[PDB]
Structures are given as C-alpha cells and as structure tokens.
Amino acid sequence: PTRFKKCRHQRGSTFCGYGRVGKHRKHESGRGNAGGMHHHRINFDKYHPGYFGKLGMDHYHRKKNPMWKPTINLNNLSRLIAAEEAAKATKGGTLPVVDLQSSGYAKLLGNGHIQVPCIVKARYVSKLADKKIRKAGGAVVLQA
Amino acid sequence: VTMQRKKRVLQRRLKVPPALNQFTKVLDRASRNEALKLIKKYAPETRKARRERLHKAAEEKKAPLAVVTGLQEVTRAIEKKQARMVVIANNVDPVELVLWMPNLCRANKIPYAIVKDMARLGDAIGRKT
Amino acid sequence: SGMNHSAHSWGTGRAVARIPRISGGGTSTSGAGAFGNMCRGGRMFAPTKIFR
Amino acid sequence: GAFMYLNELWKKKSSDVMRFIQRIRSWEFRHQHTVVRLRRPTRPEKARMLGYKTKQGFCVFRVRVRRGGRKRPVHKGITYGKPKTSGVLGMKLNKNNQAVAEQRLGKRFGNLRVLNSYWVNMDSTFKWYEVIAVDPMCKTIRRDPRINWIVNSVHKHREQRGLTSAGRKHRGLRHKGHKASKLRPSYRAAWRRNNRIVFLRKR
Amino acid sequence: APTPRTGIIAGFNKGHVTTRRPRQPSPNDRFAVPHKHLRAVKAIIADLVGLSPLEKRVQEFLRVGKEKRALKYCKKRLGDFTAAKKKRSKMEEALRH
Amino acid sequence: PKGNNAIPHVHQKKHWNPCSSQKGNVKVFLNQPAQKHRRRRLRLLKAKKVFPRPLKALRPQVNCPTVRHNMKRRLGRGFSPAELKAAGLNPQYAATIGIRVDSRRKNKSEEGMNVNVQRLKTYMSKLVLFPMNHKKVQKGEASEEEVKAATQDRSRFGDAAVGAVVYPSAETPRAVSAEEKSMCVYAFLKKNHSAVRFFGARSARAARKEAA
Amino acid sequence: PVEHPHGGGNHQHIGHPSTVSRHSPPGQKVGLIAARRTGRIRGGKAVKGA
RNA sequence: AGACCUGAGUGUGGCAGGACUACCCGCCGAACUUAAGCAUAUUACUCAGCGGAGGAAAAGAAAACAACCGUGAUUCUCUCAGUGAGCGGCGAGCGAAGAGGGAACGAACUCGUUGCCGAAUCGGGUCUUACAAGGCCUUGAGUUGUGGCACAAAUAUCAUUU
RNA sequence: AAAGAAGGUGUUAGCCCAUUGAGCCAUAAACCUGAGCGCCUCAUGAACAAGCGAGUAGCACUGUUUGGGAAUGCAGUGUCAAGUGGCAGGUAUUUGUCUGCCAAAGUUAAAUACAGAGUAGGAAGACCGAUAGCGAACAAGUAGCGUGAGCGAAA
RNA sequence: AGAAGACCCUGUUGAGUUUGACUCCAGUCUGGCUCUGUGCGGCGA
Numbered sequence A: 001p002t003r004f005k006k007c008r009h010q011r012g013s014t015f016c017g018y019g020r021v022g023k024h025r026k027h028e029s030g031r032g033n034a035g036g037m038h039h040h041r042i043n044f045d046k047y048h049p050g051y052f053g054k055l056g057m058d059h060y061h062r063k064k065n066p067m068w069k070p071t072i073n074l075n076n077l078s079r080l081i082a083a084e085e086a087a088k089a090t091k092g093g094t095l096p097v098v099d100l101q102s103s104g105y106a107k108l109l110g111n112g113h114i115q116v117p118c119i120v121k122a123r124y125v126s127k128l129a130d131k132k133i134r135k136a137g138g139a140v141v142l143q144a
Numbered sequence B: 001v002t003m004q005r006k007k008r009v010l011q012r013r014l015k016v017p018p019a020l021n022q023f024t025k026v027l028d029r030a031s032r033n034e035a036l037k038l039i040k041k042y043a044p045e046t047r048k049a050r051r052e053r054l055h056k057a058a059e060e061k062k063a064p065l066a067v068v069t070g071l072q073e074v075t076r077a078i079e080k081k082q083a084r085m086v087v088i089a090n091n092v093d094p095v096e097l098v099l100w101m102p103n104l105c106r107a108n109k110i111p112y113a114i115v116k117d118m119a120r121l122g123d124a125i126g127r128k129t
Numbered sequence C: 001s002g003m004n005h006s007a008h009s010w011g012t013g014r015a016v017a018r019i020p021r022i023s024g025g026g027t028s029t030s031g032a033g034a035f036g037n038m039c040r041g042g043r044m045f046a047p048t049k050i051f052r
Numbered sequence D: 001g002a003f004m005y006l007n008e009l010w011k012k013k014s015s016d017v018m019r020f021i022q023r024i025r026s027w028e029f030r031h032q033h034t035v036v037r038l039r040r041p042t043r044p045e046k047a048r049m050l051g052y053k054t055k056q057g058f059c060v061f062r063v064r065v066r067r068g069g070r071k072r073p074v075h076k077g078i079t080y081g082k083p084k085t086s087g088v089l090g091m092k093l094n095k096n097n098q099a100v101a102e103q104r105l106g107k108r109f110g111n112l113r114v115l116n117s118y119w120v121n122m123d124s125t126f127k128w129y130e131v132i133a134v135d136p137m138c139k140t141i142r143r144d145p146r147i148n149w150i151v152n153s154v155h156k157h158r159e160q161r162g163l164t165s166a167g168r169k170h171r172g173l174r175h176k177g178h179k180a181s182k183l184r185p186s187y188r189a190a191w192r193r194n195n196r197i198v199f200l201r202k203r
Numbered sequence E: 001a002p003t004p005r006t007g008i009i010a011g012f013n014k015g016h017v018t019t020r021r022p023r024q025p026s027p028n029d030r031f032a033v034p035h036k037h038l039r040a041v042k043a044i045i046a047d048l049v050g051l052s053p054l055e056k057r058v059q060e061f062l063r064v065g066k067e068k069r070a071l072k073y074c075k076k077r078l079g080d081f082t083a084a085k086k087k088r089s090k091m092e093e094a095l096r097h
Numbered sequence F: 001p002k003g004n005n006a007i008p009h010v011h012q013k014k015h016w017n018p019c020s021s022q023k024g025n026v027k028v029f030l031n032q033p034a035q036k037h038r039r040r041r042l043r044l045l046k047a048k049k050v051f052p053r054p055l056k057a058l059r060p061q062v063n064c065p066t067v068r069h070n071m072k073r074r075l076g077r078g079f080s081p082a083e084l085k086a087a088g089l090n091p092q093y094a095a096t097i098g099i100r101v102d103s104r105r106k107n108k109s110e111e112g113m114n115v116n117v118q119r120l121k122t123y124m125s126k127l128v129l130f131p132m133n134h135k136k137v138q139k140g141e142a143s144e145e146e147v148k149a150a151t152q153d154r155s156r157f158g159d160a161a162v163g164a165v166v167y168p169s170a171e172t173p174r175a176v177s178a179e180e181k182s183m184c185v186y187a188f189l190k191k192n193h194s195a196v197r198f199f200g201a202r203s204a205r206a207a208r209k210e211a212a
Numbered sequence G: 001p002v003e004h005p006h007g008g009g010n011h012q013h014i015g016h017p018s019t020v021s022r023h024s025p026p027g028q029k030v031g032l033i034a035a036r037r038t039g040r041i042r043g044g045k046a047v048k049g050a
Numbered sequence H: 001a002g003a004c005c006u007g008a009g010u011g012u013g014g015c016a017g018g019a020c021u022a023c024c025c026g027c028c029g030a031a032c033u034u035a036a037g038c039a040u041a042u043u044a045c046u047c048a049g050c051g052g053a054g055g056a057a058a059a060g061a062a063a064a065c066a067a068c069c070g071u072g073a074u075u076c077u078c079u080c081a082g083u084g085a086g087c088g089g090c091g092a093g094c095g096a097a098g099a100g101g102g103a104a105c106g107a108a109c110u111c112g113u114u115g116c117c118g119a120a121u122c123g124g125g126u127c128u129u130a131c132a133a134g135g136c137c138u139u140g141a142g143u144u145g146u147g148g149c150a151c152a153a154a155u156a157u158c159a160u161u162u
Numbered sequence I: 001a002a003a004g005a006a007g008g009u010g011u012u013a014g015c016c017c018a019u020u021g022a023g024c025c026a027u028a029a030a031c032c033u034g035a036g037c038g039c040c041u042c043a044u045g046a047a048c049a050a051g052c053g054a055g056u057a058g059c060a061c062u063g064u065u066u067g068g069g070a071a072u073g074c075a076g077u078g079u080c081a082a083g084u085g086g087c088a089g090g091u092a093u094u095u096g097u098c099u100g101c102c103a104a105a106g107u108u109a110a111a112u113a114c115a116g117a118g119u120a121g122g123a124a125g126a127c128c129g130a131u132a133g134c135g136a137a138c139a140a141g142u143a144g145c146g147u148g149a150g151c152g153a154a155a
Numbered sequence J: 001a002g003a004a005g006a007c008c009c010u011g012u013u014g015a016g017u018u019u020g021a022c023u024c025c026a027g028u029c030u031g032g033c034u035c036u037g038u039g040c041g042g043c044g045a
C-alpha cells in the first residue's frame, strides 16, 4: 500500500530523511558487497566472521539423495504411534510396530525418555538408543 | 582434357604399390576374346525374356542359366565358393570397389582374371558397365 | 513509451537546462526536452510493470 | 558381404596403397572447381550409409573448404577494449569445416535439400567433402516414403541451422547425459530456461 | 545365483530382501563373441594394403629388441595405453611368421 | 549505514526486465487459470474423441530409485515384454488394446514383476474389446450387450479399473521376541557397516602380512 | 607526432636514432632503413644491394 | 566404325532468389557497467552484424540416470537450489544435474550393415471415369545396386485358396 | 421476465428501438460419424550363423565455452583406434571386479515460446483520459527537416 | 549583461600524444613437422 509509506508523511519536507549536509546519492559506498576487506572490514569482521577463505574437501557432484538420514528421538516416538494403540501398550505384552522409513526418519536417536514401549523398525540406531529401548521394554528391528 | 592426360602421366611416373600394379597387368587377347564370348552366351536374360517365362508360368498356375553379375552377387559367389571363374575389370572409377577383389579369389582359391574391360564386360552381358 | 526519440542533451554552454532534447529541426518538437518524468511526451516515473 | 571389404579398405587410409590413391585424387581435385558435381559418389559405401540411393532425385556434389584456423577479420589486426578479446590469429571458428562445406553447397544450389556429407580427401591446403543433396520436386523423391520427408518445407535449409550430422556435432548433440546438460535442446534454449525470472502468480 | 540381499542398510549385500531374478539375454550380448568373418575380411585387407607408417616403425625396432620403446611409440601416437599394448601385440604376431 | 544484515546475493545483474532498451528475460503466469481451463476443456474434447476407451493408457507400478525414495511406488512408463508374456499377452498386440509397453525396463526382481502381472490380469478381465465386424464376431470379444453398456473413465491415471498403486501393509502389533530382548542391535549394525567400510583397508593389511 | 615518427617537439629534431631495423613494422620503418653504415661516404664506392 | 567414361551445346518439364523475422535455429560478437582503481572475472556465451525455417522451432526413441526394493525417448512446470554442489584477483560475483509431485502421451518408426533373394525397382508412354502403391509396353536410368524378407515388441523361409 | 444485457433515442428507459432465447434455413472441398456406407478395382492380415555406421572416437598442442574443477562441450592442426569389444560411472595414473548402455546415419505428434510479427474473430480491465495514453482519438510516420543515414510535430 | 572559469585545485573523471611504465596484439624474423616424391652415395649411431 502506497498510502502507508513514509514517503507520504515526509511529502513536503524537501529532503525525505536524508539530510542537508550529506545527500542521498547513488551508491556512496559501492555496489553490493564491495570493499569487504577494504572499507567495510569492520562490518564484515564483526557481524559476518568466518567469510573470506577456504575450508575442507571438495565433494564434486554432490547427490543429496544417498546422504539422506533424518532423525527422531525416543521421546518423540509418540508422534508416529496412533492414539488408539499407545494405550494398549504395556511392557511384556503386545507392542505397536513403528516403521520409521515410511515416515521420514531414517535414524533413531536416544534423547529423552521414551513414553511408550514399541518395536521400532529403523535403518540406523545409536548406542544409547538401542540400550534404552531394550530396557524400556521394546526393541529395534533393522531395515533397509 | 588437359587434366585427364596429366592424370595418365602421373599414374605412370609415380611408383605404384603392388595392389594397383596388378590391374595394369592384364590377361591377353586370346584368353580375353575366349572369355567374353563365353560370358556372352551365358549372359542374363533380358527384360522381355524375363517378362515372358513368368507370364508363361502364371498360365502354369492358371531362369535357365546365366553368369553371376553385380558387385554384391559376385562377392557372394566367392564367399560361398560357388564361382568357378571370376572375371574382374581393370578400370572402375573408384578403384577401391574391386581393389580387394583378386585377394578374395586368392584366399578362397577361385581362378580369377583381370581383363581389359568394363565396357566390354557390360557389352557381353547387356549393360553399359 | 516516452523513450522512442533520439534525444540527447545539448550539454552546457547554452542558457538551457541539462536535459535530453529532441534532435533535428523544422518541427515544433525539435529542441524540446525529452526523457524525464517532468518533460511532456517523456516517460513517467517508475513505469508500471505486469510482474507486479 | 561386399560392403565389409569396402569399409575395411577405407580404414586403412594410411597404408601405402590408399596413400597412393588419395595422392592422385588430391592432385586432380585441386585442379577442379570449389564445387563439382559427380555422377557417382567417390565412396559409395559411405554415401549409402549416409543416405544416398541410386535413385533419380539424389545427386552428389564435392565441395572444397580451406584448412587452418580462423583469422579474426579486424582491420589491420587492431581491436579494442578488454585484452581477452585482443587475439586475431589463434582464434578458431566454432563450426567444423564439414558443416561449412555443407552450407556452401546449399546456399549456392537453392533448389536442393542437402542431407549430410562425408570426408573425401585432404591436402595441405584443402579438404573435400561429397555433399549428398536431393531434389524435392522430383516425382521419385515425393512418392518414396523413406525420403519424402525432405519435401516438407521445414527442411528447406537444414545446413544453415545446424540440423545435419556435422551440424549436430558442433552443437554438442553427440552427448546426452551430464555432458550435454547446458546444451539440450540448444544453448539458447537452456540459457533462456535457466535465466528467465519466473514470476509465479500467487506468491 | 543372484546373491540375495541382507535386509539391513549397511554391509555386504545391503538391500531389501526382494527375490532377485537372473540376468536375461539381450541382443547386446553378441558383442563379446568372436567375429570370425569380420576377422577374415580384415586379414584379407591387411594382406592387400601393406602396413601403416606406425606399423612399420613399431616392428622395425621390435626386431632389435626395444619392446618398451615400441610401447612408448604407440602410446604417443595412439594416445590410449590399452590400444598401445594391443598394437604392439599385433606386430609381434606378424613377426611370428 | 549498513548493520547486521545478511550478505545479500540477490542475482539480478543480467538485464532481465523489459526497459526501454532491453527486451527482457522474464516469464509471468497470468495465463495460469486459462491454460488450466484449456487443458481440461481439451481433455474433455479428447475423452469424447476416443470414446469408450480410457483417456489414459494403463501403466505399470514401478518403485522409486535412490534410497531416500525406496519405500515409495509410482506409475511407470510401460509394461516390460516379460510382464506382458507372463500375462499371456503379445507386446505388439497389447499396445492396441490400451496398454503402454516399455522395452527398456529390466525386471530385476520377482515381487515387482508379479505386481504388474496382476495389473495386467485385472485389466483383461475388465476389458471389453469390441469386434471388428459387429455382425461376424471373430474371437472373444463384446456381444453387443457389452458393446452398448460400455463406458470410459477420466480417472486421471487409468487406475479406475486396475485399482490404485499398491503400497505394502503396515505390520500388526506383536510381542517382543526372545532374541530381540537381549541381542544388541547397534553392535551388529556397526560390525556389518565396518566390514564394508574398512574392506581393503584391513584386506591389504592381511596382504601386507601373508607376504612376510 | 600523429603523422610521422620523426614529427613533433619544440625543435625540429629526430629524437631516436634514425636508422631503423629491417624488422620494423610498417609505420615504424621510416628513416634510414637497415643502414649498414651512414655518414658522408669517405673513400671508395661500395656497390649497393644484397 | 562403334562403345564406355569424363565433359559440352540446345530442346522440354520444373525449382531457388525477395518480403516478414515477435518467438525459434546456426554462426559472429562488443562496450558502457560492476569489482568503490583495474587488466582475470562481470555485464554476457547479451546488444549490434550475417545466414535460415515454421506455425511453432529446436529436442527426441539411450554408447541415459543411477548405485536403488532400482529408473526408462524428448520437451515443459513446480521443486531440487541461490545450493554445508561447484566455479571465482576463492574478490566482486556466478551457478547446475539426478531423484520426487505433475503437464503431454494410441509414440513410435526408416535406412545402412549382416543373412537370404537379385530389377521383383524407378521414370516415361499408353489403356482401364484413373498423371491408380492396376495392367501392358519401354534401353530410358539402374547391377559402381533399385527393391523385397528377417534382425529382442523376434520365433523367422517360400508357397495357395480359404 | 428461461429475457434486468451493460448500446441508441432531445433529461436518469426492463416497457420507444436494437439487443438478450429455444430453435429454423442454406452449405465447393476438407474435417467428424460400426477406422460412416454401397459398387468397381487393388493390395494382404490370420489360419490350415553372420554383423550392426573410420580421418570416426580418442590422444597431444593451441583457442574458446562451461558450475564442470589434472580439462563440461566444441574448433583448428598433428596424430589416429578397437571389435577372438567399446562408451559412460564428475581428482590424474597402471591394474582388476562391477553396473548401465551400444556413438560415429534418418524421420517423429502433443505438452513449451511468441520479450517491438501477421491473418480472421472474440473476452475484456481497481489502466490512461486530449501536455495523459501509441509519435499518431484528427487526410500521422503526416506537414516539416537534413546531401544523406534519418529525424519528426502541432492538431 | 554574455557563459555551470577556458587559470588553479579536487575526483580512485576523460582524451590527444610520448616512452628502457604495466599487460598484451598485428608485422618481420627464426626453429620444428608438414606439403614432399625418385636414384646413386657419404658423414654418422
């Protein structure tokens, strides 16, 4: 909306908030990120530190489909179990089966407390997630 | 005409490899005039002689003998070793068409000839060439 | 629109303002100013676009 | 078959027999004109591979191009601006000479639709190509199903637009995969596609 | 025969268990077979035209020894190194009668 | 005064908008609802043109590649000429009776082959196949009580009379087994992982030890 | 100086030596082109040419 | 004498030429500008210049992607991705592809080669209501190969009358 | 009133006029219809061991192009293949295993563009309203101007 | 009055001209292979 603009307010004030001494002039400091090491060195060092250089190996032709590995924790496995089926879940009885790769979530991690024992079918799992679901009463079944 | 006459000098002055020399070495007259007279009498039947014997055989439901002619057909008659003698011309205008042709008869042991022809072979069989 | 002339500024050294002016002569538009939001027959400020 | 002896004889181009025949041919070709019509092609095995038949409307022309790189035609070797664009002699054309030979035939004999050509002979100064053309108004060519497509008026100068085999070479259309991604269907068809600022309607 | 896959994501045979099928014969399986007529044609043409300037040079000093110099002269002029070995090995057969 | 702003990288330096000197390089979607309407109007004009055959030909169920998408399925290009022959069907003949055929696809497993044979077995039982001559019936064809009750689908995939894409059924709730209560799962995963991850790195150390 | 290599200055002088190389480009090859010897020939008379 | 080959001259029947050129195909090809200077780089494989079609053009039927439980011609769209790709005085800046959801889609075929046949071909005449994918006739082209049959969607060749 | 429609008429029209529907009439071919339907003529569907594109690909130097980096594509020249296989698998080399495909010949609809085209005809708009909007609401690329390329009104 | 000082200075503004400025380019020269074949020899390794 043009009517909501600062232009309409300072309409009549003959400098438009740019001043009498130093005017509004076309590109007084350069076009773009010019002068990053020269005359904007204090801006580029203070706010944007690790710019300006090289780091690490070069992965020519990265494919992001084989390096696909999403992550879910033990305390968020209730997101994948239906509400009808968590209430019937007791340790030593019949537990729900969660197929992780049908939901995203290629890897199970072991953060937090698992609020419902279940059988997790995961492509990957960690030390402290395997340890912590076998004591909670479920298991983890590997899949491909 | 001034460069078809200098083309003939230049093929003579330069040292010719033994694969194109062999076409300058030609079967003599008594064996060429004997050969093309035998190619003449077993020439292929003409268009009228092949339009008849078929219209006289569509009445039977109502090739006598010839020499093998053609660069695709004579080649098959040596790969199969069916020809008893092959007669090669000496002056085909891209010479690579029959440059390999005496060595195929030599690998398969069919008797060949290089005669002074391509106008005289086509006259024997009813063609131009 | 407003830009389809071959106008150039006359520079400085005449008592006329530094704007592009219509080339040629023999017509009433010749020498007249061009190519600005304030000239007549010139182009509007920030001409409107269909990718708004 | 009879082809296999012709094809393997034209792979022995550096042997002493084929170096004698191309010696004689390159002599008698540089005493002819730039464009020469033949009754029969010089290489019939390679002409019929490339599309020629011994029909009525087919016809073969041998076309001569000069060898070497492209001297940039700036006046007196003097050129301006940035130093990357300063070279005159080492610059090279982005069309091969087989395409240039096909375009010199078809810009000269306008009533004929050229299909592709083939290498014939080299000299130190010239290269020769037999360019197969075909007469689109010949009644044989119009009634024959495997060649009548050339009579349609979208093939009028295939050579001038890079639609022959030698045209498709210097366009890079020998490659299809990750080796041709910037150039499928055209460099301009991919430049336009990759650079046009798309404005979605509700955004 | 097609070596069934183990149903976990990592390791040897690391896939989904899926009852693999045998490879089926294609028309492109007929390139790895001996071409006994294509060789007989090439043997007639080679016994017709003589030898290349490369092929005479490679085996004029394959008589005096110099087998790694024949391989270096081929790879300079053939570019490829597998083709350099094969061209030297085709000259050693013409020297074997 | 610049402040704590992100470094811009806006990529608009190549003469893209039509000004008084530039033709532009710009693509706007103002005809989006009129080409939306055109394609539908032209699919209803085509569904009349073909009637009563399906508007879209039958396509196989194929998996998806690239381990991100292994668990997904979609519709392929055409049935291979081994799924067609396993359905007792000529591939040159199948293209006339509404089936897409793909000579390139290789059938590397029997589960993916049997899914698409069952799509072909379902399709032939729904197929009507009108006669050439509606007086002299030549083969198993329609009987004109079928060649008059016949209709088409506009079902957008050809999956009206073959059914949708068959995903597998999720596993029923079960108990934790005797092995799964005590067998460590990470150690078996990492042993299998490290076997291929250090193959060659440890297989040359034995090669550095079989030789002295 | 725009027209000729010897032109210009405040005195009419050739600045550089007026004996130019054989390999000078056209425009630079003015003056005494590839002079083997200059000056008033004091002595005999050598035939001129290569 | 005649032939064949390579070239002429005329007769007859045809065609190309210029226009337009928004989009599209092939080449040719800058500089201002940006880098707070400037030469690499940028602008831009853009403007201008030359050639050529169409109602679209171009591409297109795997010497492809992938690394999967695999996919399946091209083109286009959203996304991939302003990218923990990559290129770059590694500066200013630039810059994709595979996968996935879709649009379209009856989408596939023809030579060459090989094998088996060998003028069964093509053009001109002329006769059938007919410049017949018909007969009949023609040395006129053509055997220095026109055509037919088979080649992964394949199960193969000729008969013939149903 | 299945018609309210938005133009004209001396001043604000559903009723003054034209309009605004169902349908009627007439059609060179082409297009579409049991690949519409007969006849003549002419084709013919189904039954009863060989190889597959050679100055090519590659390689070297140079030039350019690319995100393509010990070289993505191309060009020049030198060199120049293999098939008792070759190409691609995004860090160069030699050697293996693997996987995909079979370059160097040809046609091919639609989905895409129309960023200063054109024909025939529609729909219009939170646009402009005679210094605005096309230069041009008018005998406008006109009168005029310049040797010319060209420039170019007012109204 | 005339005309955004024609002097002087500033600008990370030009341009004509110069040159053992910086980066290059035509031209001229020189070497390599090429075009480029046939003989009898000779100096060589």
Ligand SMILES: NC[C@@H]1O[C@H](O[C@H]2[C@@H](O)[C@H](O[C@@H]3[C@@H](O)[C@H](N)C[C@H](N)[C@H]3O[C@H]3O[C@H](CO)[C@@H](O)[C@H](O)[C@H]3N)O[C@@H]2CO)[C@H](N)[C@@H](O)[C@@H]1O
Residues within 6 Å of the ligand: D203
């Ligand atoms: N208020 C200033 C005006 O903002 C206008 O643009 C404003 C919006 O129209 C514009 O919104 C854009 C949207 O148009 C575009 N299609 C996509 C984008 N996601 C939006 O940006 C939005 O998300 C970004 C962060 O992602 C916010 O910074 C921004 O404020 C928000 N509007 O960003 C601006 C924030 O108000 C015009 N650029 C211009 O008229 C003017 O600068």
Ligand SMILES: NC[C@@H]1O[C@H](O[C@H]2[C@@H](O)[C@H](O[C@@H]3[C@@H](O)[C@H](N)C[C@H](N)[C@H]3O[C@H]3O[C@H](CO)[C@@H](O)[C@H](O)[C@H]3N)O[C@@H]2CO)[C@H](N)[C@@H](O)[C@@H]1O
Residues within 6 Å of the ligand: J020
């Ligand atoms: N020829 C190379 C060019 O030399 C130029 O630079 C050269 C010039 O500045 C200068 O060249 C001078 C020349 O001006 C002056 N009039 C004559 C003098 N002979 C030259 O000198 C140069 O050339 C001769 C060899 O002929 C050398 O003996 C000498 O060492 C060398 N300095 O010496 C530099 C070294 O050659 C440019 N840098 C460039 O165009 C290019 O590098």
Ligand SMILES: [Mg+2]
Residues within 6 Å of the ligand: A054
């Ligand atoms: Mg480093």
Ligand SMILES: [Mg+2]
Residues within 6 Å of the ligand: C003, C004, C005, F020, F021
């Ligand atoms: Mg303009």
Ligand SMILES: [Mg+2]
Residues within 6 Å of the ligand: C001, C002, C041, C042, C043
């Ligand atoms: Mg205006």
Ligand SMILES: [Mg+2]
Residues within 6 Å of the ligand: none
């Ligand atoms: Mg793409």
Ligand SMILES: [Mg+2]
Residues within 6 Å of the ligand: none
């Ligand atoms: Mg024209």
Ligand SMILES: [Mg+2]
Residues within 6 Å of the ligand: H033
């Ligand atoms: Mg600009």
Ligand SMILES: [Mg+2]
Residues within 6 Å of the ligand: H036
């Ligand atoms: Mg500046």
Ligand SMILES: [Mg+2]
Residues within 6 Å of the ligand: none
């Ligand atoms: Mg242009």
Ligand SMILES: [Mg+2]
Residues within 6 Å of the ligand: none
């Ligand atoms: Mg096309």
Ligand SMILES: [Mg+2]
Residues within 6 Å of the ligand: none
């Ligand atoms: Mg044929």
Ligand SMILES: [Mg+2]
Residues within 6 Å of the ligand: I055
């Ligand atoms: Mg090459």
Ligand SMILES: [Mg+2]
Residues within 6 Å of the ligand: none
């Ligand atoms: Mg095409």
Ligand SMILES: [Mg+2]
Residues within 6 Å of the ligand: none
């Ligand atoms: Mg008014």
